[PDB]
A and B are shown apart, each in its own frame.
Chain A
Amino acid sequence: MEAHLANETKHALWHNDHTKGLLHVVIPNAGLIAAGIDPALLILKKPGQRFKVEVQTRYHATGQCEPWCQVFAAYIPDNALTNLLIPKTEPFVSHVFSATHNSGGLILSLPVYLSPGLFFDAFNVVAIRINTGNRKHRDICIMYAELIPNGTRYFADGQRVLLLCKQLIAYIRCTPRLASSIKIYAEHMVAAMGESHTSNGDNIGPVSSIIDLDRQLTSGGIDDSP
């Protein structure tokens, strides 16, 4: 998340040539189990190989091709979701929150075309070059239909932040430290969110707040269309 953020300045400084719009795409590492290679040699081990990833287009009966794209990324093992969702607290790491066995993640750059004549179809396959063994490289090939599905999830993200904020408030309130000013202002802020929601209902209501992805990745595809 740091190398991509550092490299974003090149895309930010771009003013003309709007046919290449960089965006953040997260590719899960669930398919790496069938790769059959050593994950240790994929992030930082025996430097000198200089592994790189290239993105190229594939036209059909028109000619020419994209002049590749110099991009790179790195993986992150050991519950990457925990360290990408929960803020980094390495100096004071403790038993914070609760989650199951997570996985890693990766960021890949995929240019997009934006113009008054947008258009959309499925006739172009994006080729990804990986600097590994050519024997059973275990690559993927998708068309442009999956790249642009014309949808977004704006309503499902609201409840995800609520669970995290409730958990952090509970963690802060569970330790009896600091002064009573923090407690009283937190109580005032909680009461300010509703008259009958807290006085006649509940303040926090932990009930069964478990960090899981059940209703977040199932529904909410087309919900904010005009």
Chain B
Amino acid sequence: TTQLIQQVSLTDFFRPDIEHAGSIVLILRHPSDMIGEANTLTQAGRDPDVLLEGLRNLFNACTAPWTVGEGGGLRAYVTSLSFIAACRAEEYTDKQAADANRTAIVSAYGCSRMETRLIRFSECLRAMVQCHVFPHRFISFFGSLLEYTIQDNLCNITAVAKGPQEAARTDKTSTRRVTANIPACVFWDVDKDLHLSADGLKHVFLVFVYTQRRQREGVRLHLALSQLNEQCFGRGIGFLLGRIRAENAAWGTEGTRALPLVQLSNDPTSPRCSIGEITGVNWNLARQRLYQWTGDFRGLPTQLSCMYAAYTLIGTIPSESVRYTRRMERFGGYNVPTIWLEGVVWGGTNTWNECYY
């Protein structure tokens, strides 16, 4: 059930630093395909020049423009976990430490043009989010890379999947077993609504909510971990975010006489002439009164306004009753706070089953 699959990538969205475990890598999509698909889903409302400007800026900022969009299997299609943590995990648990970690990372990795790249990425993400385009419809499940190697300007890291990774005894790490750790921003408080004991096997879910406000938008890549059923995850998310769900619904309405005589005209006085009065006469002059509704509307977009909750079954645990310990680690050129866990594996499928409210 375990396979060794490696990807031929040199430097896409990562630096040739010391490899570390507990990293999650996703697969992006070509901007041309997404803009070609969304040119009809935009439905006007915003100027399309900002998207083109953002795409041009991203193409210019990306290294080796002659390799992206052509060639073989060498392109920009993967993203390291460090970039995601620096861009999203900064205002979740402890800001006064998250900002220090981000500054240390951007000072130790780039040290020459890291701030410009970070601001360009932030602006491109804001442009790609404000245009009411969801990129999660193309992301597929990917494995976790776990390998230690180095070469002359080359690095080939293999990936593993669900199975006996910790029991295979590869004898290639510091200890006789493998290392499995997760960052600080992996668990959120749930006892306030789940005071009942979590007797059972817990599940790991990835949550990516969406916001819709007045000319302002943001991303929130949370990581839920609850024993509740999959169908109740959306209800729990809606209940937890009930203070902002109403505001989102009110701000999402962007982009009248009823008929109470039906109950009285159903049985008596029924002018059922939908065939006899149409197939016989031309009906080009008898259409005088009819109904008018005393209104005029064109388009009622509601499906793309109430979508604010999502969850996917990614990652499981071989055993329950997992206990987390808060400790410190010293590695690399700087000491950063980390949380050590045990009995955690990866795998699964990226089956998007959302429940909007």
A interface residues, Cβ below 8 angstroms from B: 6, 9, 12-13, 15, 44, 47
Contacts and interface: CB of A to CB of B under 8 A. Distances in A.
11 contacts: A9-B298, A12-B296, A12-B298, A13-B296, A13-B297, A15-B295, A15-B296, A44-B49, A47-B49, A47-B50, A47-B53
A15 B256 CA distance: 11
Nearest to B298: A9
A15 B44 CA distance: 23
B44 A6 contact: yes
B215 to A, nearest CB: 13
Nearest to A5: B44
A53 B190 CA distance: 53
Interface in B8-62: 44-45, 49-50, 53
Q: Which secondary structure characterizes the binding site on chain A?
A: helix
A162 to B, nearest CB: 27
Interface residues of B, number: 9
Contacts of B295: 15
Contacts of B296: 12-13, 15
B123 to A, nearest CB: 14
Contacts of A12: 296, 298
A44 B47 CA distance: 11
Contacts of B49: 44, 47
Contacts of A6: 44-45
A151 B78 CA distance: 65
A47 B296 CA distance: 36
A50 to B, nearest CB: 11
Interface string B282-315: 0000000000000111100000000000000000
A188 B24 CA distance: 70
A9 B43 CA distance: 13
Nearest to B256: A15
Nearest to B53: A47
Given A6-B44, A15-B295, 11 more contacts: A6-B45, A9-B298, A12-B296, A12-B298, A13-B296, A13-B297, A15-B296, A44-B49, A47-B49, A47-B50, A47-B53
Nearest to B45: A6
A15 B294 CA distance: 9
A199 B50 CA distance: 59
Contacts of B44: 6
Contacts of A44: 49
A47 B50 CA distance: 9
Interface in B297-352: 297-298
- 3 tightest CB-CB pairs across the interface, nearest first? A6-B44, A12-B296, A44-B49
A177 to B, nearest CB: 31
A6 B298 CA distance: 12
A13 B296 CA distance: 6
Nearest to A14: B296
